[PDB]
Amino acid sequence: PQITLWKRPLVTIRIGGQLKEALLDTGADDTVIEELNLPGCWKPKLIGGXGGFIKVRQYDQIPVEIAGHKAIGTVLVGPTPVNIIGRNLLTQIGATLNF
Amino acid sequence: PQITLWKRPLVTIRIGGQLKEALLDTGADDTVIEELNLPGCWKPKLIGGXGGFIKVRQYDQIPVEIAGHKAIGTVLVGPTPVNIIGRNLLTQIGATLNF
Numbered sequence: 001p002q003i004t005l006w007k008r009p010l011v012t013i014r015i016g017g018q019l020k021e022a023l024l025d026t027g028a029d030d031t032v033i034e035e036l037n038l039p040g041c042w043k044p045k046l047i048g049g050x051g052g053f054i055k056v057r058q059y060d061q062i063p064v065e066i067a068g069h070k071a072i073g074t075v076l077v078g079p080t081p082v083n084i085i086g087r088n089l090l091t092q093i094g095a096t097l098n099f
Numbered sequence: 100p101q102i103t104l105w106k107r108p109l110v111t112i113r114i115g116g117q118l119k120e121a122l123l124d125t126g127a128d129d130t131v132i133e134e135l136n137l138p139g140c141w142k143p144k145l146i147g148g149x150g151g152f153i154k155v156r157q158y159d160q161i162p163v164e165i166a167g168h169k170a171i172g173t174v175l176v177g178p179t180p181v182n183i184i185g186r187n188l189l190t191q192i193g194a195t196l197n198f
């Protein structure tokens with residue numbers, strides 16, 4: 001699909017069995033999801049934007065479907081106010097910016 | 100142009116006579132640029148990401164050329180790690196996300 005930017009580019013994603021809404025963010029290197037009681041194995045990371053940093057849990061090879069398109073990669077979990085799909089997953093669904 | 104996302108989408112912009120590098124950022128509502136001087140009145144605003152909030156100076160109807168494409172709109176100036184072009188100017192240059 002084509003997503004315009006008149007409003008926030010929010011889409012549905014499936015991750016960890018669950019359906020969530022997430023922002024497609026070309027300004028994010030990484031993908032960051034709201035607290036989610038997932039199983040796995042993880043490494044601590046701090047990620048920053050803006051004002052400051054949040055501490056997150058980094059999980060690898062997590063399957064994520066984004067508007068019906070499958071991806072799989074690193075997902076950061078933590079107290080973000082908004083679920084963010086970053087470039088690590090956007091590249092996998094073939095997302096480009098055009099103007 | 101069509102821009103892929105394997106690397107950060109950094110482009111050259113011209114703002115108040117000066118050339119800068121900035122990130123095309125679909126996750127930002129607004130355009131935020133590092134400290135610099137700009138003409139006209141400003142007003143103070145707080146903006147946030149994610150990791151915290153910062154205080155910025157809001158300047159309205161500032162011309163900004165983004166990879167050769169002309170925009171005129173709001174620019175927030177303050178302490179960011181990265182100059183970011185947000186949706187308010189991305190819509191003006193006709194930018195969309197496609198996959």
Ligand SMILES: CCCC[C@H](CC(O)(O)[C@H](CCCC)NC(=O)[C@@H](NC(=O)[C@@H](NC(C)=O)[C@@H](C)O)[C@@H](C)CC)C(=O)N[C@@H](CCC(N)=O)C(=O)N[C@@H](CCCNC(=N)N)C(N)=O
Nearest residue numbers: 027028029030047048049082126127128129146147148181
């Ligand atoms: C709410 C969560 C939205 C997240 C975006 C993030 C981002 O603008 O894409 C920024 C841009 C680069 C940093 C300056 N990217 C980031 O913050 C990302 N950081 C990174 O990618 C960093 N990488 C790592 C590994 O940490 C990089 C800096 O090295 C993080 C998401 C982590 C992966 C963001 O902060 N948006 C702000 C930008 C400021 C602005 N005013 O536009 C925003 O829209 N803020 C609105 C509020 C949001 C809600 N608004 C709304 N209308 N619904 C504002 N008023 O305060």
